Amino acid sequence: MYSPTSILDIRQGPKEPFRDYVDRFYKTLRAEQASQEVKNWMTETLLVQNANPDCKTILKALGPAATLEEMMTACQGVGGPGHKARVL
Amino acid sequence: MYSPTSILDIRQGPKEPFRDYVDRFYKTLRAEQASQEVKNWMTETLLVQNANPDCKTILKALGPAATLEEMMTACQGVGGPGHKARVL
């Protein structure tokens, strides 16, 4: 097991909001043992890669300079609600 | 285009020798604009990930310490010939 990490296990759902993906991706990263340098690259490469086939298209149109705030916010309405109904 | 690099475009063939994958992966990396820190992580994570469904199994049995020399050499015989016939 060279280093299967766990971030690679993150993937925005087809109809899931990016904000959730970022929150989860950051949640995982915070639990990922790696150099910050990786975060800048990984959080900039695999962040939009494992994204849903929807967020990748829109997020791209934003520009390779868009910030997380811009990505999450601009991705608003892209996916369905993340909190609703839910079973006890 | 955040940064789709090109390394992600590398993937050992189902019956291709790892030595070729490493040579190609290193060939691409040498043409990849990234921090060395990424090489240590990427060349250790995505190196075995994009590998063929064959090399990954064997290479794993070697141990997360197996050096490149150990990976390429030990992967000898796993895949078929890398140079033969070829059309002019």
From Swiss-Prot, chains A, B:
**What protein name is recorded for this chain?**
Capsid protein p24
Chain residue ranges for the region called Dimerization/Multimerization of capsid protein p24: 2-88
Q: Which organism is it from?
A: Human immunodeficiency virus type 1 group M subtype B (isolate HXB2)
Task: Fill in the PTM field for this protein.
Answer: Phosphorylated possibly by host MAPK1; this phosphorylation is necessary for Pin1-mediated virion uncoating.
Q: Which gene encodes it?
A: gag-pol
Q: Subunit structure, per the record?
A: Homodimer; the homodimer further multimerizes as homohexamers or homopentamers. Interacts with human PPIA/CYPA; this interaction stabilizes the capsid. Interacts with human NUP153. Interacts with host PDZD8; this interaction stabilizes the capsid. Interacts with monkey TRIM5; this interaction destabilizes the capsid.
Purpose of the protein: Forms the conical core that encapsulates the genomic RNA-nucleocapsid complex in the virion. Most core are conical, with only 7% tubular. The core is constituted by capsid protein hexamer subunits. The core is disassembled soon after virion entry. Host restriction factors such as monkey TRIM5-alpha or TRIMCyp bind retroviral capsids and cause premature capsid disassembly, leading to blocks in reverse transcription. Capsid restriction by TRIM5 is one of the factors which restricts HIV-1 to the human species. Host PIN1 apparently facilitates the virion uncoating.
Q: Where in the cell is it found?
A: Virion
